[PDB]
From Swiss-Prot, chain C:
Polymerization of globular actin (G-actin) leads to a structural filament (F-actin) in the form of a two-stranded helix. Each actin can bind to 4 others. It comes from Gallus gallus (Chicken). It comes from the Eukaryota. GO terms for molecular function: ATP binding; hydrolase activity; protein kinase binding; structural constituent of postsynaptic actin cytoskeleton. Belongs to the actin family. GO terms for biological process: axonogenesis; cell motility. It is found in: Cytoplasm, Cytoskeleton; Nucleus. SMART domains: ACTIN. This is Actin, cytoplasmic 1. Actin is a highly conserved protein that polymerizes to produce filaments that form cross-linked networks in the cytoplasm of cells. Actin exists in both monomeric (G-actin) and polymeric (F-actin) forms, both forms playing key functions, such as cell motility and contraction. In addition to their role in the cytoplasmic cytoskeleton, G- and F-actin also localize in the nucleus, and regulate gene transcription and motility and repair of damaged DNA. Disulfide bonds: none annotated.
Amino acid sequence: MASGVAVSDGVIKVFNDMKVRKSSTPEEVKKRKKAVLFCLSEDKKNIILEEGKEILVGDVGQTVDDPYATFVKMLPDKDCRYALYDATYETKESKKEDLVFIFWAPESAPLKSKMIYASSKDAIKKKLTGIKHELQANCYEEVKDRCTLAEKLGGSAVISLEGKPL
Amino acid sequence: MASGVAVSDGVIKVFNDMKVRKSSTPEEVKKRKKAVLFCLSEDKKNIILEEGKEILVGDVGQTVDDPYATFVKMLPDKDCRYALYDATYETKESKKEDLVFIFWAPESAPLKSKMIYASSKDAIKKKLTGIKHELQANCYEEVKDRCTLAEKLGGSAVISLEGKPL
Amino acid sequence: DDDIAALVVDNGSGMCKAGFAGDDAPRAVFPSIVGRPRHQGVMVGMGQKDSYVGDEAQSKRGILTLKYPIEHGIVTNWDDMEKIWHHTFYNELRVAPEEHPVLLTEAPLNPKANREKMTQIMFETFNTPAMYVAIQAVLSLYASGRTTGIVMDSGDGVTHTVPIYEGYALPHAILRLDLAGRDLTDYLMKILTERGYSFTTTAEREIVRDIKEKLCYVALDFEQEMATAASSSSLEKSYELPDGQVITIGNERFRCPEALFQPSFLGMESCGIHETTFNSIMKCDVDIRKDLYANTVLSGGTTMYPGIADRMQKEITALAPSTMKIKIIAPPERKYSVWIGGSILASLSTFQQMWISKQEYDESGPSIVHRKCF
C-alpha cells in the first residue's frame, strides 16, 4: 500500500491556524487550540477536522487543569482518530512547544474505520510535509501515561511534564 | 548592548553640589558629602540619589573616624548600587581629592536588580561626561581593602591613605 | 506578553538558541544545519522538497547535503540563513515576529558588508518592527557588572577572545580559534572510539552531546591524574545510553577538555587556547595588565565542565610573570550568560528610545546602523 487518502483542504486550514496562533489579545490566547481532532468523514474520500472534539490551552486556566487527560477521555480505543497536540512542557529553563501529531490507532477499534486509518498514515503525513515528532498508542494506558510524552523530550532533563506530574 | 538608562536630573543635581562644594562656614564644611549613594528607582526608568544612604566628611571629626569602612558596611553584595566617593588622601606633601565613581556590582547580588545595573554602566557614565578614575569591586574584600584605593594613586608614593592605614 | 517581549536570536557555528525578555535563559536551542540532495538522493523517486533546518535534518544527514549558513561566527550563504529565521519563529519559538521585536547576536569584528545586509533582510523579508545587533563577548563582561577586562568566550560553535575596555573591543587583541563546543563533541566521540566502542555513523554523533554535559570533567593536574587512571578503581564513571548499555569512561573524564589546553593530542602544532588568551594580554597596555587579571570572565557553551575553573587558575599562574594577584570572575549563569545579557535590556522603556526601527531604515537606508551606535 502507499497513501490511502488525498486531502480535502480542511486539515490545512485548521493546521495553518495553529502554526501562526491566530492570536493577539488575552481573549484569544486562551482560545488557542492545544489539541485538535482530525478524522476522515464518511466514505473516507476526504480528511477533515472534527467540530465536536477539540482541546483549548485556555481550558487549563478556564476550568480544566489537565488537557492531557481530557484527550485520554475523549479518545476511546472504540474510535480511531487523527490528532494534533501541542507539547507545552517545561524543561529546566522555561517552556516552549513541540508540534506533535498524535496517532490514535487502537487495534481493538472497529475494524472497518480503523483499517482505513491505519493504511492512511503515509497519506495523512504526506500532507503534513514531514512532521517533527510523533506519539502513537493503540491503548488507553500508553496515551494516559506521562512518560510517553516525556520520551520524546529525552526524559533525563525534564522535571515537570505539565509543571506537576513528573 | 549600549546604554540601559537615560537620566532623571537627580544625579546631576547632587553631583553639581559636590563639584562646587556648596560650603563656606565651618558649619557646612563638615556637612559636605564625602560619599553619595546612587541607585535606579523602581522600574529602572530613572536614575537618582538615595536619601537614606550617604557619607559626610564631617563624620570623621563628628564621630566616625573611618568613612571608608562605613561605606563597606552599607554596601552589601546583597544590593547593587552606584556611588561617588571623594579620595581625600595624603601623598607625601599634603592632601588633595580625586573624584572617583565607585561601582558596586557584586556578581552574587540579586540578579534582577544587578543585571540592569551591570548593563547601565555605559549609560550611567554617559551622563558623567567621562570620569577621571574609577574603582570597581564585586565583593567586600576588594571594597574593604586600602590597597585598591591606593592602586589608583600609584602606590609607591603614598604613606597614609587616611593618615594611618598604610 | 503585549508591549514588545523582544525575540532574541543567537547565531553561531552551531547549537543556535532563542527566547523572550525577562527570562533567565533562552527557551529553545537547535542545531544549525541545512540539507538538500546528495549522492543523487540515495535511490527511487528523487526531486521532492528538501531544505531541512533543525535536528530533524540530523537524521536525514546521510541523504541530504549539509551546508553551514554560519562558518565560524559569520554568514556566507544567506539562502540557508533565511530558512533558519523562518523556522525559528514559525516552528521553534511558535510566536509571531510581528508582535515581538527581534535582537540578533554577532561575532566580534563582524565584517561591514554583512552588517548592512542583515538589517536589510529583517525590514523587508520579515517586516519586523524593531531589531538590534549585539556582541556575545561584550554582554558577558557586561553581565558580571564590569566594563574593564578580558573575556574568553566559549561559544556554542566558535571561541573568540575579546578584551573589552569601556564598551570598545580591542582589534589588536582579538584572535579567532575554531574549537568551541560542537567540535569537542566530535572529538569526544573520536577518543571514545579508540578505547573500544563502535561509532561509524553520523546518526549516533548526537548521542555523545548528552555525554558531554554530564561526563566532561577537568583535572586539577593532568599528568598526575594520568598515573591514577591506569589502576582504574573509582575513576570509571557510569552513563546512560538510550538502548540500555552503559559506556564507562575512566581516564577520558579529564583528557577530553585537555585538547583545548593541549592541541598536540589532536595532531596540531598550534599553541593552547589558554596560552592564546595570554598573547592578547602581552600585546595589551602594560599599566592595565594587573587590572585585566582581576577582570577575567568565563562564559558560554562548554565552560560548564566541572573543574575547569580550577585548571584555569593553575595555567595562568604558570604563564604569568608572578608577584601578582590573579582573579577569575565566575557567574552562576555562565552557560546562558551570552543570551541572558541580550534578553534583559530589550524591554524596559528607555530601551524604546534606543531601538532601530523599520521606519528609520526606509529613510536613511543601510547607512543607519553605523551611525547610531555610540
